[PDB]
Amino acid sequence: NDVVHKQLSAFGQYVAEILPKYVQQVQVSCFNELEIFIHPDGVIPVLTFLRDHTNAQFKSLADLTAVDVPTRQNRFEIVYNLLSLRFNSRIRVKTYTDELTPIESSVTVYKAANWYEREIWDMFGVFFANHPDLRRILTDYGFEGHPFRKDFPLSGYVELRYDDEVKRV
Amino acid sequence: QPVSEVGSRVISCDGGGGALGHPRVYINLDKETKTGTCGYCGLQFR
Amino acid sequence: DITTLTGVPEEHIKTRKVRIFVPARNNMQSGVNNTKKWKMEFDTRERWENPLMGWSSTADPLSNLVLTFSTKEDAVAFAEKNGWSFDVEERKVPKPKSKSYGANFSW
Amino acid sequence: LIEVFVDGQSVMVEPGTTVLQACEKVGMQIPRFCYHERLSVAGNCRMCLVEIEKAPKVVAACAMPVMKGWNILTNSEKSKKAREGVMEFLLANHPLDCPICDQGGECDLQDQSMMFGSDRSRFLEGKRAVEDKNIGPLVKTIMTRCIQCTRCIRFASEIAGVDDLGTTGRGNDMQVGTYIEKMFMSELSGNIIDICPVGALTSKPYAFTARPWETRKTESIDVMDAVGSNIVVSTRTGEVMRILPRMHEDINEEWISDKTRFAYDGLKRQRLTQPMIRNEKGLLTYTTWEDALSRVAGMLQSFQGNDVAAIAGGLVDAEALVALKDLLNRVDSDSLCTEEVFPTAGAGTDLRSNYLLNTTIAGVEEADVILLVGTNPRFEAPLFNARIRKSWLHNDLKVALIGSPVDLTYRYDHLGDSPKILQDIASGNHPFSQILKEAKKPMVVLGSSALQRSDGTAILAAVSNIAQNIRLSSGASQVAALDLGYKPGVEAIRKNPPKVLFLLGADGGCITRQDLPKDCFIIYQGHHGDVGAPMADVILPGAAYTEKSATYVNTEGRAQQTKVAVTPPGLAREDWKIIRALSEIAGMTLPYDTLDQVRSRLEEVSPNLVRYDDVEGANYFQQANELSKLVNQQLLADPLVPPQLTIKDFYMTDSISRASQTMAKCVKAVTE
Amino acid sequence: DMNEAKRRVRELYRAWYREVPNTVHLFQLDISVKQGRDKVREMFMKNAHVTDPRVVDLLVIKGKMELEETINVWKQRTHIMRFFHETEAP
Amino acid sequence: LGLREIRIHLCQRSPGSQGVRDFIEKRYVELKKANPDLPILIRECSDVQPKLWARYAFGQEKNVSLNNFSADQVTRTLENVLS
Ligand code: SF4
Ligand code: SF4
């Protein structure tokens, strides 16, 4: 449909003008998916308004994905889906991040993001500032190296096995 | 197996039946000095 | 250097080397697509055989790993961020060549 | 250079040059078959059709040169309908053989069928199919899968130079198979297995054994020749499957030899696995690695100073030679003995350049005359023979044999006998000396075979004089050692020296065991039981070239390295590492231990080897080398016969090649 | 800058060291009570050459979580005995 | 006669090399005629500082670094070369 592509286009322009201290570009994937960019420092302020009405009542994170790419000056590339209800439609803001720079946590803005901060922390190196409690999930205890680092072998570097002489795995 | 022979020339071997055997292939018989073994079936022809 | 951050055992940031290169065209192919774009293959280690069934049982943690890139400098810098030993190799684009259907008919 | 528009953007393209080459320059890739650079253009297989910006009908992309601001819509719909149009025709008869055809993993015809060809079939009749044409020990012709991109004939007539095979008949029934049963053997016969577009021609020895998506594809270089061509070895997990050429402008350029292509097969058969001491009975017997190495480690201390005499094979091994070198200097005296009876007085070694092939082989096409003396180029170095033939078509430049009856593919002047025609032209007695005078950038090539022949030094002196004259008028296991001065290299130092140390006696062990009654003991650090092992006490298992990282030097002086592939077969280790163990046992532990520390030792003892692709040097200048050799000069003789002559003689050289099943099948093939 | 982070790590050593006997007690570990301490000191020597600014504080972030786990009885005898690599062939 | 070998390294383009480059086109043949004996390897190695190396039966090695020295100075250390 052309129509949706129109409305998303114009709306992308709309937000592009409303708050352009940080919207690097508002590309519309041709199959009707808008997606603006964000300077990594700018995460909270954008998303904040993204809940706040103008039309951007995009409540509820659908997810907090963390695409990786070995190239680029900063490899990890965070992504935020969002959904507005009354105007039933979805957008997708996203940023970028150094292996070492601590981007802030976005838990307060989208509310249901507490679990995700922990996820991406234990599936990646990236740290979220002002997060109440990053800690491991989806792993063993020690384990150490983050998976999903695009490098890092799927077979990992370790294995458990039970050993009778010490009577322990 | 006995070697099948036909007075014609080119023949098609499907390995027995339609869509239950190997892909249809035509075995040439340009040289009478040798049998025409099928690629998949393994059945000689002349 | 981020060696402490990665959980990787010291052995494999040490006693082995990456081997950056842009892959050669499979020569059976006439295609060119897969040729381009740097990748970051590691060196091979030992791989024996399963006493049973004859499988190629293998010890090394990370033999199969491989990574694409857009630019070589980015690749070298990449491994440097990892503190990796490396063997950078030149892109080896074929020289352009003259061609002429009529030169076949000089005399 | 003309401006031309690839679909949209302007491109300042080179004058003339085919539309295909234009889009190649923008990088967009036209579908192709019959065309191939490093071969020749042809109008068959019109899968390359592309649409002119304005002219209504499409033209073959590799045909028309670009000109005058042309625009060309590769993606234009009419082009696409054209391509589907052709592809349906190609697939109208190619037999349903994908699962069994050995080309199945990457046949270009498949991928072209995917990217462009319409998916529904709409042929609905009967494919033609044709009988096989047996051709030799190697290639497995199947035909029927043939699509008459003549290609292979354009390979044969224009590179192998043989024109035995060719097209036959008209319309359908026309066949690229050669008429008459006669077998087609040639030294470049192997490369067609690469060149063949589909599965119509694929290597018998490798056949069925594996599938393309499976095998890992290591990059390295050949060792069967010191020519040093780049390759892609391919292994199905822990075991080598098949070799293919890897293109490189300075050497192989997409081609490869043939003895090398099937050389790997010998690795699988007889090979060193465990150390083997002589027993009291004189039988070879399997042993622990440790007791053996400690045994000889103590054994060679008594003879510190001279006595002990290491002997390299013809294949080995840069890191092994530095390691063994310190083995020989930490011990007080030593035997740097190669194998080829290469003359050393007057020292071509110290100046480096005399044993170098001065012009790049890449520079060979620039030379306007070639002076081949003593040994035929094709058997000694096929890629070079391909190079000179390549220019032979590209240029009308002269060449000359000095001298043999050998059958090189192309027209060339034949001379007479060594001191005769050589010293005569050197003194300008030969008319040939004149044409050598007027010639631009003259090239004189002297084979390694000539360097022995009883009085090798005399032959070298004669050829050097010719080099001096031109200037006045104006207008393995070999080059590596001489990069590090292991001359004499010849075993002529003797003076019988007890406890010889083979790196590989499979080659020079055929000679004589004269030191053995004086000292039967011979450490043997080979990787086959061939020749050297049976007549040698204490056997050391050792790695083949696929495993070792060790560099080898191009005859040009390029010194590029092989990479690891499949690890040593058994208890065997990489060769040098045994020595770095040995010195450590002796108490004269060497400064290096890692491969890279000892690459730092190349970074001292040379340090020009640590420049893997860098042939260039300051050069000693030919006149200065001439003066350096001027003080010797000695009596000569007429005869000069190259070792190989026949191809069957070419099939067997180093012990690995005789361990080959398929090479044995070839030597049986040509002889029967 | 460095040093400001080094104090952090010393604090961390205090915490670990003092906690260790409780670890051996509560977990019924039969490691020599000293050995855990020594091994702690060693693990502290493992990165005793790191010199980057932010990387070290990040190191104490990853250092907190472990004492965080042993204090909460998260991980177990297996998981905490894991550090000693005791089953490995020399 | 302790020395077994001698070697020399020379980049083709550093200026500090030419005072040694000049040493080779002319002094060299004089040297070999003066030195039938032990090997005198020359290299075109592009090490920025040209060098000198000397083997013993001991395996110990002379290691003479040089910078932009006159060829006569090269000759000087070369005559300092002895048994
Ligand atoms: S190789 Fe010949 S047969 Fe095998 S798939 Fe490609 S085209 Fe079909
Ligand atoms: S031989 Fe190779 S190239 Fe010549 S037609 Fe048959 S397949 Fe095409």
Ligand code: FES
């Ligand atoms: S290559 Fe253009 S016609 Fe086949």
